[PDB]
Design a protein around this ligand. Sequence first.
Ligand code: K
Ligand code: MG
Ligand code: MG
Ligand code: MG
Ligand code: MG
Ligand code: MG
Ligand code: MG
Ligand code: MG
Ligand code: MG
Ligand code: MG
Ligand code: MG
Ligand code: MG
Ligand code: MG
Lengths: 197, 191, 172, 136
Amino acid sequence: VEPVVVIDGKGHLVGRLASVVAKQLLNGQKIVVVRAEELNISGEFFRNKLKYHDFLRKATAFNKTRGPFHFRAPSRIFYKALRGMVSHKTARGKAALERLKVFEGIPPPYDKKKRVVVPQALRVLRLKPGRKYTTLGKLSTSVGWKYEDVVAKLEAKRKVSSAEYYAKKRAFTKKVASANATAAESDVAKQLAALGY
Amino acid sequence: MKYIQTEQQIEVPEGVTVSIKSRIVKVVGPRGTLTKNLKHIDVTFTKVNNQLIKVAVHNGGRKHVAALRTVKSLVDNMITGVTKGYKYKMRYVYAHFPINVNIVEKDGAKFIEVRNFLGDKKIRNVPVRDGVTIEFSTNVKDEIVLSGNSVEDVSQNAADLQQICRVRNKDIRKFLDGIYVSHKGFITEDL
Amino acid sequence: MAHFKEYQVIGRRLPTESVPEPKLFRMRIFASNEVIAKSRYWYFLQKLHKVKKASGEIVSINQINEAHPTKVKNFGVWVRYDSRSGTHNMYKEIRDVSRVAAVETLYQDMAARHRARFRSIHILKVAEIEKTADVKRQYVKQFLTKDLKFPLPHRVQKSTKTFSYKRPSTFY
Amino acid sequence: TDSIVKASNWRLVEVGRVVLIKKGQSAGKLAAIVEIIDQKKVLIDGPKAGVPRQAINLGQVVLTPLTFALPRGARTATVSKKWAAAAVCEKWAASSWAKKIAQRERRAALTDFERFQVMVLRKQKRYTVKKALAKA
RNA sequence: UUUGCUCCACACAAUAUAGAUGGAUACGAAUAAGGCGUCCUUGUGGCGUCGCUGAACCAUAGCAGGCUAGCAACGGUGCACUUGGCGGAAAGGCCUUGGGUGCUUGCUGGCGAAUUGCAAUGUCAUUUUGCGUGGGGAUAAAUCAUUUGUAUACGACUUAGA
RNA sequence: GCAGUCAAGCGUUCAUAGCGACAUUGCUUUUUGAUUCUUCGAUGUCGGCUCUUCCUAUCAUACCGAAGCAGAAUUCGGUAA
RNA sequence: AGAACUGGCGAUGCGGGAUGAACCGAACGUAGAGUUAAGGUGCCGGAAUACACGCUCAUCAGACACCACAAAAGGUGUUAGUUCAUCUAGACAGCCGGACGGUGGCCAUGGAAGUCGGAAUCCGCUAAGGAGUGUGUAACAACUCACCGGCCGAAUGAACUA
RNA sequence: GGCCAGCAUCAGUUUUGGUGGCAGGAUAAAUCCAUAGGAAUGUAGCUUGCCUCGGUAAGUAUUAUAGCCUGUG
Ligand SMILES: [K+]
Ligand SMILES: [Mg+2]
Ligand SMILES: [Mg+2]
Ligand SMILES: [Mg+2]
Ligand SMILES: [Mg+2]
Ligand SMILES: [Mg+2]
Ligand SMILES: [Mg+2]
Ligand SMILES: [Mg+2]
Ligand SMILES: [Mg+2]
Ligand SMILES: [Mg+2]
Ligand SMILES: [Mg+2]
Ligand SMILES: [Mg+2]
Ligand SMILES: [Mg+2]
């Protein structure tokens, strides 16, 4: 319903999130995924690390620069999960993938935009309580991603700024809730309540 | 079998205050304060009468109800650590070479230094975890005492000291040299 | 097989000139429809007496409704089933409001826990346990304690929309 | 000096618990838990709203915060009597939850002319509220 | 440089559109817990309240939105200025001061619409490019050829030469 | 060719440190067979030399568990190519 | 490799089994509409991230016949059952006490005292104690266990089945 | 006369809804009503012991100051 939908990837069950995003892309909706380092995969961290090492051992024997490329960053792991489910060798799949952007953290363009979630992909809603899960940032660091610390520091700075912004917004929201708390016994307010507003 | 409800009781002695937010348990007693994160177990804590904390698992399986009693034991150990404390006594055992155990300082970190283990020239250094006090026992030959509020911390320090003195390339049934936990009790006696 | 109904099926072992009015055997059969009920009746009659569908007849098939479909009951169910390597008898206890619901639960549970298909299961007996403390299975006994209450932690509300704007909660 | 343990008070599956049916023939009516059959099944009874006495999966209902005194296994007449005595319908109607449901129903029932009137009245209220916010 | 280059404003031409048709509307964290409000002894505190989805909130009336007369109140909103601050992860955006100016549907009026003929997206957006008219700004290099050998099959590389 | 399961016995005593009969279950395609599906208008037919890579059923090296491991030496086994 | 009956492929496209002569479904003029078969409905990919009951966590999970493999034997992993037992006259586990006397029971043995072995499996006192469950000695000795007690107080144990 | 369409009333094929009247069953079973008999996951009452306000615990007690089950109609 929005020109661009920004999904906060934190705790979002990378495969199910990739399914949702792939369907949105192929249906023509522009999707930006932020905080890809905070995505989750079901299964133990050791399980998913072994899976990534099984992926890593696959390479073109006569020239390793031709074989499958093993991207280490969490955003690129998500992008691989999504490209494997988009028909990326066709022009339509290329357009669908061009409708997509994945980021670690929330870069400056999107740190001031609304972030949505996908409940059908949310880990807390999908995974049975007590089931173990992996964190994409930790897995990526274990398999060679170099920027977990930098992303963490920039996320802390962004969270500080966002907390200040939200304190200001909460104060203004309290002012507005006071303003509509009064003028609620006026005739206009009673008519609106009679009409459902 | 998916038991509907399983609960355990945690008795709280008088001088102990237990603050339980979502699953961050803080126990305060005469000897200090302990904190434990139990967010991996999915249990429910409820205060009954200020001397009793119930911990419950609803619709739990076999492993879940086992972890419930594990949680109860862990909180009981925190309370025991802040009321009685925990002390582990270890005796150095050696056939020929005397094991020299001392407290040394390196950048203010208070390592336990083990020299002459089985005649080795190598010097073993076991860091002392924060909160663990090391005392060398008089009137008992070759005895080290590790004390603290956290039973996990004191037991892990004793385990580290024991493991650093493992014999390699020899029949350990014959070469019994090492530093072995000889007693696990409390700091305060007969309480 | 499907949502079950219970039928009484009475069959005859068709009369001859020497033996008029044969012994009119009856069975309570759980089946999804009357064709299957009659088929199961003939299957068990061929397991029990020297008769077949060609040499007998169905005198009556009548659906038996639950006497008190809105009263919660504990049922004891004796079943016989074929595993991959043998035949075994089992006793299970099911809490439900009707025999048909208890039997559906029994078939689902046998399929889930023993991989026993419908064809491999014989319902020996379904009887209501009138008196508690004759309930002998803890997974039913735990539901008979006085003033039983339990919460439903970690509620998962189904979203009608692909995207949510609120980071929902599992409180209940 | 005293222990502090967060309560996290859930709504409990219990005899006399008031539930709201979300899907089925009822689909929005209130019922009362008559008895508990299994961890996932209860026997409910909604006689005031017209909900038949039935065994229902707990996934088909949502527990409300309302409870009233009802014996286990009470029949339809007893459930109706205790429901009327406890005035469950009024207690639910007073809740914000039922008020929100009624608001959604009213908004869905609005006509085009009523929506135009809603916009006009919203503009009037907005004028007054913005003036008050600027004065404050 | 057969008057070249760049930027801005306007006009006119082309050029296409992975696809606008009110608004991508910003805490963080947890989910066997939280949000908001309030109070105090400021905490892993008390009290109240909320969720059970955004079916929300904002916006939204006027020849695709005209021309005018007032009432009420110093509000809302757009425009071009302007004071200052913050933002470097891809900042290229956010906030803010003052005055000017247009609209205001917060309320009450007057005038206009028609014949696109009973519908025909009935053309309202942004992407680049060119050209002309004014204004602002600047006034180089690279390669070939020669040369070097820290290089070299040839290209290439590394050097030098007003 | 390699690996299991049982366990009568060997191992001075003691089944299982190391072995292990009578049986029995497998795995592998580096043996040799069986077959004749591809190739007879033609896939150059031994071995060695050279060079790269792969497997592990690991000889050595790393860290270990076990022993009929006192030391030394050795044997069995694990992670390991 | 060779026979019997039938159906097929050869001679056959089409939908499904990713892929494939034989399998499933269905056999074919050119089109429109509807309904289906076999197979499917997270995304690739048309179609429910449908509903319901359970089971499974795999440091080589598993995921639809033909078909692209796995066995014997095992596992207080977990689930569901069968049978037999113990238990408020006190069960299981746990800690503590006793664990005797005839008697070194009879026999080769060099020695053999419960514990290298052959047979004999008794009696007494018993709440209870094997002519001994193991460690140990050259033999003893000394420890230990069956068995009975003290403490606790409600369920527990074994062999099997899949 | 040609090209592309819109609407209405029909015809054939078909898809998706709203709603009405009947038939059968154990002339559904239920619910409900009336009656009889019961025990318990034992309601009121009563007895006993404790204790922080005031109830619990243990017995008895089959409807009472809640109800439930079964049969019959
Ligand atoms: K040839
Ligand atoms: Mg690299
Ligand atoms: Mg050695
Ligand atoms: Mg050739
Ligand atoms: Mg060749
Ligand atoms: Mg190996
Ligand atoms: Mg031919
Ligand atoms: Mg064919
Ligand atoms: Mg296949
Ligand atoms: Mg689709
Ligand atoms: Mg097996
Ligand atoms: Mg001896
Ligand atoms: Mg028609």
